[PDB]
Structure formats: structure tokens, C-alpha cells
């Protein structure tokens, strides 16, 4: 229905998802001079030692690496968060060239891509209930710039030709998402939304300040995926990012001075 094409992209989404023009939409531009250091924020606790990846899926708009979220294995806590958020999946947004691809921007700078690690608040019991609540999800966002290769990304890269088209999946067990993190966990945070339909306003965004570096060859492989299904006219999966939305009555807080 919706997508990132020439006729169904972000500027059209509001016609079927009117919350697209809402008061807490994501992504946003992070103005680094306006974001205030908040001494009351805590260090993030990223606890992925027991993560169980299961499968990788091309869903027609990105690829999702899915985790076993049937109990508290990989969780996110601390930072701006109360309680425990379970990792359900991660995916990326990226561009057709290195000068665009991220959803969040930093002083209007676009990165080549952006990783989203999606977690749901276990106090609501299941993901479907969590997305109906203003504190239902926590998404950890990590920028990608092009430079040296990211060793921990290569296993993802190498499975992509097996899920080229929409609706294809493959086994993807024993993947360690810790290999996708930067050194520092300094972050910005603000209340927002899902960045694809249904655009629900249920997310506490935690965006890391430090980008990870990936190689040109790695991101080039992202750009060989297809939005289309098998046998259909080839549409390269590129520019699957929503642009920055109005900040409205929101404050972006920094965990660092
Ligand atoms: N409003 S939307 O979900 O982005 C959407 N755009 C289009 C364009 C052509 C046909 C169906 C739909 S559904
Ligand atoms: N791109 S994101 O805000 O991380 C995100 N959006 C959506 C939409 C529907 C279902 C899951 C997710 S996760
Ligand atoms: Zn995303």
C-alpha cells in the first residue's frame, strides 16, 4: 500500500494514517545546541549477552532480524526508561548514495544509514498491547557512516542475497547484536513514534551520539535488496527512510555534557 516510491511515499501516508500529522511523530532533527544535558538521566543498560536471534525477513520495506522475545533475554533498561524492554527485532534505513539514508538527522546532517533496535515494555505483556501505550516501546537508534568495515555486520550482509525479495526469510540464529554497537553509549532522547505505518505514538527514542563505521561494500549490499516480490519488476530497496518531522512541543535531552 504505502511505501517509499514515487507515488506512495512518506508525503502520502497521512491519507491512510492520519496520525502522520500528529504531535509526536518521528524521526526529528536533533539540534545539538538546543538539546539540554539532563543530569537526571541514567546510563543506558544494554543487556544482550543472552540474545537469541532467530530469523531474517525481507518485509518489502526493510529487512528485520528477529529475536526470541518470549522471555527476558535481550533487554534494554535504564537511561530515560522505567522498567524492562525486550528486544524484538532490528532493522536499518538507508539511502541510494552515502549522503542520505538516516531518519534522524544531527544539525541537519544525514548519515548513510540508521540502525533501529526495537524493544517493547514487558509491563504490557505483548508487543501488540505495548504499541497502544505512550511508553510501550523503546527504540535504540544508531547512525552508520561509511569508512572502515564493521566486522559484526558482515554476517548480516552475507545473508542478504538469500532474502532479495519481499516475503523471503532465512534462518538467522546465533547472531550477536553487540557487534553493531559503537564504543560510547552517550545518547539523546525524546518521545516519538514508529517511523513507518501505523506511525503509532508509542516510542521512547534513544539515539546514540557516536555513529558506527561500515564499509562502502557493506552498504552497497544493502542497496541490492528489492522492495518487490519474486519475479516482479525490480525496484531496488533504497531510500527507505522517512524525513524529519516537526518537533512541536517536545524536548530532546542529552545524557552527556
Ligand atoms: N496513504 S498511503 O498508505 O501512503 C497510500 N498511497 C497509495 C498510492 C496508490 C495506491 C494506494 C495507496 S495507499
Ligand atoms: N522504524 S521504527 O520506528 O523502528 C518501527 N516502525 C514500525 C512499524 C510497524 C511495526 C514495527 C515497527 S519498528
Ligand atoms: Zn526503523
Describe the structure.
It is globular, with a radius of gyration of 17 Å. It has 257 residues and is mainly beta. Strand 6 and strand 7 form a beta hairpin. Strands 2, 3, 4, 5, 6, 7, 9, 10, 11, 12, 13, 14 and 15 form a 13-stranded mixed beta sheet that branches. A two-stranded parallel sheet has the order 1-8. The chain is 7% helix and 29% strand. It contains 3 helices and 15 strands. The site of one 1,3-benzothiazole-2-sulfonamide (EVF) has 8 residues, from loops. One 1,3-benzothiazole-2-sulfonamide binds next to loops.
* Distance between the amino and carboxyl termini: 44 Å
Provide the CATH top-level class.
Alpha Beta
CATH superfamily: Alpha carbonic anhydrase
- Structural category: mainly beta
The count of helical stretches stands at: 3
According to CATH, what is the topology? Carbonic Anhydrase II
> Main β-sheet, in a few words?
13 strands, mixed
Bound molecules: 1,3-benzothiazole-2-sulfonamide, zinc ion
Protein name: Carbonic anhydrase 2
Cofactor: Zn(2+); Co(2+)
Pfam family, one: Carb_anhydrase
Subcellular location: Cytoplasm; Cell membrane
Task: List the keywords.
binds zinc ion; 15 strands; binds 1,3-benzothiazole-2-sulfonamide; 13-stranded mixed sheet; 257 residues; mainly beta; Carbonic Anhydrase II; two-stranded parallel sheet
List the helices and strands and how they pair.
Elements: E1 29-30, E2 36-37, E3 44-47, E4 53-58, E5 63-67, E6 75-78, E7 85-94, E8 105-106, E9 113-121, H1 127-130, E10 137-146, H2 154-159, E11 169-171, E12 187-192, E13 203-208, E14 212-214, H3 216-222, E15 253-254
Parallel strand pairs: 1-8, 2-15, 10-13, 10-14
Antiparallel strand pairs: 3-6, 4-5, 4-11, 5-7, 6-7, 7-9, 9-10, 12-13, 12-15
The structure holds 1,3-benzothiazole-2-sulfonamide (EVF) (2 copies) and zinc ion.
PDB class: lyase
Keywords: Anhydrase, Mutant, Lyase
Assembly: monomeric
